[PDB]
Amino acid sequence: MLTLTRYVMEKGRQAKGTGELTRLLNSMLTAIKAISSAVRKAGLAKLDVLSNSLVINMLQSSYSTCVLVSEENKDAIITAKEKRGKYVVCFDPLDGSSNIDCLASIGTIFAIYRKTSEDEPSEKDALQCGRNIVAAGYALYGSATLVALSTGQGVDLFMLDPALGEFVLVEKDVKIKKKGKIYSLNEGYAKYFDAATTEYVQKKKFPEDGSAPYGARYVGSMVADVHRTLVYGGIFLYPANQKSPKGKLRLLYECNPVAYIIEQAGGLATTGTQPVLDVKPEAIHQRVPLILGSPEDVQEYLTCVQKNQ
Amino acid sequence: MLTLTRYVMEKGRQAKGTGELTRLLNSMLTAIKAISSAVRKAGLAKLDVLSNSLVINMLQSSYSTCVLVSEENKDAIITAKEKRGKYVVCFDPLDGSSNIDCLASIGTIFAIYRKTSEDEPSEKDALQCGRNIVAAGYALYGSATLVALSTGQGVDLFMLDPALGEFVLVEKDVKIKKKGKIYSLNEGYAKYFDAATTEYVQKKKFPEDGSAPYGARYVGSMVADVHRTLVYGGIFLYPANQKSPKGKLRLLYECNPVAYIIEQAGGLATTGTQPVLDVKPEAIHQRVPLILGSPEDVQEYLTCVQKNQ
Amino acid sequence: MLTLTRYVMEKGRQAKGTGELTRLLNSMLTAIKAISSAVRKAGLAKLDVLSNSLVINMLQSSYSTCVLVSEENKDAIITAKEKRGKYVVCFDPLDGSSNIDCLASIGTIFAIYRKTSEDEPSEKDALQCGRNIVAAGYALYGSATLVALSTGQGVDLFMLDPALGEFVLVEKDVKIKKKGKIYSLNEGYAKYFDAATTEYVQKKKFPEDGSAPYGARYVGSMVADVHRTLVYGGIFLYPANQKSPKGKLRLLYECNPVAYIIEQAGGLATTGTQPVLDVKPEAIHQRVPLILGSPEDVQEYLTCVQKNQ
Amino acid sequence: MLTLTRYVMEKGRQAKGTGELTRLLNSMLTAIKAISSAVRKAGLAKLDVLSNSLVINMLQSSYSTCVLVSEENKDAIITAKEKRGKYVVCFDPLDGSSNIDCLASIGTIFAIYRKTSEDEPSEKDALQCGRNIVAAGYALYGSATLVALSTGQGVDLFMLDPALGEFVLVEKDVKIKKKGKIYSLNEGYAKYFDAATTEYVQKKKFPEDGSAPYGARYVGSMVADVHRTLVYGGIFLYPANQKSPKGKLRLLYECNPVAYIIEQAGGLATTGTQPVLDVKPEAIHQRVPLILGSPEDVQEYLTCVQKNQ
Ligand SMILES: O=P(O)(O)OC[C@H]1O[C@](O)(CO)[C@@H](O)[C@@H]1O
Ligand SMILES: O=P(O)(O)OC[C@H]1O[C@](O)(CO)[C@@H](O)[C@@H]1O
Ligand SMILES: O=P(O)(O)OC[C@H]1O[C@](O)(CO)[C@@H](O)[C@@H]1O
Ligand SMILES: O=P(O)(O)OC[C@H]1O[C@](O)(CO)[C@@H](O)[C@@H]1O
Ligand SMILES: [Cl-]
Ligand SMILES: [Cl-]
Ligand SMILES: [Mg+2]
Ligand SMILES: [Mg+2]
Ligand SMILES: [Mg+2]
Ligand SMILES: [Mg+2]
Ligand SMILES: [Mg+2]
Ligand SMILES: [Mg+2]
Ligand SMILES: [Mg+2]
Ligand SMILES: [Mg+2]
């Protein structure tokens, strides 16, 4: 039984670390477990508020953090001097608000950076390119609870063993298919799509090479849809549209973490004009377009962008 | 704490029943709990086979059944003479095979009939119109575990309390909105749709009255998509198409139960030409088209069918 | 998987009952499960008050009761006319107060009678001899959670399956050994014992026939000590002493239920002068001496009583 | 929520450790959780064998150990060179065999030492006086699951939060009463006691100063009885007797750990002639007499030893 806590401590032993990142991850994972439990019994009772407190408190108490960015907080949270550590965490404590009442899969998203500037800790420490991620992942609260995690050496999948109360490694170093057979976007925005998105979607439904149309899936929780894309392959799209000209999804704590996971699994994640991880953030709640998945599907989307530009 | 077992026994006390239906439901619910538990720890290990055995064994042992129809069994299962009861159960022991690996919501579906013929128990006892349902419902194994149940007096929702190990009533007599704002179908089959489906879908994305386009959602597990339709309103479609000319979804143990639930909640469920519950089944594994949800959305779909016929 | 709910409903099907006792037992068992859960997480927070409310509410709501006697209530609780059923329940909702802080096994004890008088329901309906018990048992909240139950056809043991959230039959028709090798009493009261108890205890430690002395065990929760006596054999004693001249243990909701269980398993349960189940109660909180266990050990205790009288 | 994993990592951050002890404790605690779960569902199925494997595998995999002593293994287990760490663990993976069938509290016991010799790792590294313990504690699998732990700075109590799946600090720096009112030993061995034990026990039942006799408690699992002694005060005795002239309890992995806990809480733990922690072990499965608890009660026992020597 390779537990996440035993896996992470072991990974930190081979790298001769001080144990600070390990302490941070353990704290994050503890918050995730409390969130999983609250989610499993939610209807028997706001959850946004609770999951946000849980994450902030656990992270700050780890003595590993200097700056936190949460979806739930207008401004960056600076860690009190007495608990100052070297890491910056951007997180979405509970994503998939739209699906809570209807019991669909929802999740938690996070990315961890090392503070590199010499200055006093500020929001600017949270404005690194995703290419500078130290660790990132997500939890999926679905038919079972799962964490996808990467620290730069590929993507590992862990599942909450409910009897044992701990995360157990179920898949090591997962790789996305080069090409899938599923496309995933909200086609309710079709009226507002750019020409590139329209053309790409048309190619999926009416291919010109005799292949079967792709199947469509859209849970409407990003973590569920991205996780499906990871394990089954294909493409997930939340592009710019007329109602959301800069996209809807948030760069720091939605797009960068999933982009990091998808790239680590051998996939691609793009704004349409450049890799998501290469976008230099200008503000903590900045939005970007997100198109991600199997490299050949994303590469085909990029061709549509290129001939329509 | 109004538990499902206490709710069902109480419902049977006011109706002066022998307790046979109550015994049947309790058995079904016990199978559901075992399924929930196996689902929650699935990745840590086929599940179709297991959930099928669980349901068959629990139902047969209730002394309440004479005939069972399962998705997993070519032929109807006749209950051994010594355990013969008066009820017929059609069930899908685990639905949403496509979503198991990716951890999306999956479910169990069932409908219960009283055997009305005088003959020896046979498959023909399972070929009643859904309009003759005595009890029907589904379990949803999602971020939490839920059962929707009706015995003819509206739809009640129950949630598995994990600490207590029992189903607890969370919503009594639920009603679907008259009109929703979500449409749900696999648009990957667009190339194969009939004119009516094409036109309806076009109206959702490009309305002609100045209203916002509907949002699209499609989990790709029927129970998840139908449950969302129930609680948020809107429309779910699995119509006939060129690849599935009679539809894909199964009449006895997929469509009739959800149709029964949706109608009990004040919604509509149609094949496109008639109510699902009014279809006289000719074979236990018969397929039908399924269009269901908020009455005004379904009524609008039926208008598209009518002007394209 | 023979669950308690399926076992009890089945037992009621063969006996052509109205289902009223079955509804009562299910309710009692639901309270037991809630108690088990509260007990498992007690230190992470009175419990007497909670467990009492749980039992009273569940029993009254079953529409099966007319009179309740609780250890926690000075007077008998008469069921409101609208929920009147035919049964009387005497219960100790949580026994083993002394062991809660130190985490030793604790339990719940109950006996069920049919009201036989024609009069208005009163405390007098709870003053039947234990010989008139319809059903009785206990729950043990120990290293695992167990229920011992009898309805007149021997003793069955059930264990809470934590994954499944239900009681499962683990042993059918259990029989106590004719003679054991363990004696169980608080020897701290030795100064206050009568001559009979003194002599019996001396015989256990200094036998005159060359046999090994009995081992001593005393958890100090009656349910734990009685359950051990049931499965390992031997003798449990809470006799009269100078500080408690009529004994300490309560007749209605401590002694009668365990006496009923022990007798059903082929054991004996005595006051020292007569079987516990044959004592005609005069008051709802009456105390009796309790000596119970393997028939040959109890029979040997009775010989000490006889030669010292 | 101060979790054990967060508490232990934090305790290791202030002490600038390499994290090796922390990794060891986490591993031990993970084994404890698996044991708790197996114990909670034991009757629904040897456990000695399982719990032994769990502990050995978890400890060896921590890269923190060089030598293990288990009750279940004749010889010391030398850690393979590739996983060699600096610590020695003596453990009883599951104690209280006698109480498993009857569902009474049972436990796991452990003591951790730093290897101090320069030689190749051998059994001799496990023969340090308990006074050289680095960390020690026990788990109690009772009505709830608890760990008592000390690393030299007093005794902390943790409880398994079943919803959260982790140990949570419930009491910091616990102190035993100076004098209690409970004595705990198997009085079935009275025929075989030495004069000192006889006299001490007589004083508890027949005091000569007008005080009330002590109450007697004896669960017959050492961990349960010792834990009760810790939280309620009093005295626990397993002295030498004619059948067990050197005592029964094992020095390395039963007596030293509980002695360490009791001393850290301000109590005393003696063989009758010297502190348990000061005994120099000569063999890994050596037995000693054990008398422990509130200092004034133990001090009174020692006076009986002294006037009978
Ligand atoms: O309804 P829409 O516009 O498709 O938005 C759904 C998206 O919004 C989110 O809830 C976060 O903004 C994602 O989880 C999901 O992908
Ligand atoms: O991939 P498709 O064709 O959309 O099929 C999905 C449907 O199939 C099912 O798995 C059952 O056939 C449903 O749960 C779901 O609605
Ligand atoms: O401390 P004593 O006098 O031995 O009393 C213990 C007895 O009291 C009870 O807590 C109930 O009165 C029983 O569970 C137990 O047998
Ligand atoms: O039956 P006895 O001799 O009192 O032995 C009980 C003791 O044995 C053990 O099981 C371990 O030897 C302890 O847990 C307990 O204190
Ligand atoms: Cl989902
Ligand atoms: Cl106990
Ligand atoms: Mg969010
Ligand atoms: Mg979000
Ligand atoms: Mg199926
Ligand atoms: Mg199906
Ligand atoms: Mg009580
Ligand atoms: Mg009591
Ligand atoms: Mg042992
Ligand atoms: Mg032992």
Numbering used by the authors:
A (entry chain A), B (entry chain A), C (entry chain A), D (entry chain A): 10 to 54, 72 to 335
What does the literature reporting this entry say, word for word?
The enzyme is a primary control point in gluconeogenesis and is important for the regulation of blood glucose. Fru-1,6-Pase is regulated by two inhibitors: AMP, which binds at an allosteric site, and fructose-2,6-bisphosphate (F2,6P2), which binds to the active site. Each subunit of the tetramer (designated C1, C2, C3 and C4) has an allosteric AMP domain (residues 1–200) and a catalytic F1,6P2 domain (residues 201–335).
The model includes residues 10–54 and 72–335. Other than this difference, superposition of the wild-type and Q32R mutant structures revealed that this variation induces significant conformational adjustments of the α1 and α2 helices. Furthermore, inspection of the quaternary state indicates that, compared with the wild-type structure, the C1–C2 pair in the mutant structure has undergone a further rotation by an angle of 2° relative to the C3–C4 pair. Thus, the tetramer is in an intermediate quaternary state which is 5° away from the canonical R-state and 10° toward the canonical T-state. One F6P, one phosphate, and two Mg2+ ions (M1 and M2) are found in the active site. Based on the electron density maps, the F6P molecule is present as the β-anomer, which differs from the α-anomer observed in the recently published T-state hmFru-1,6-Pase structure.
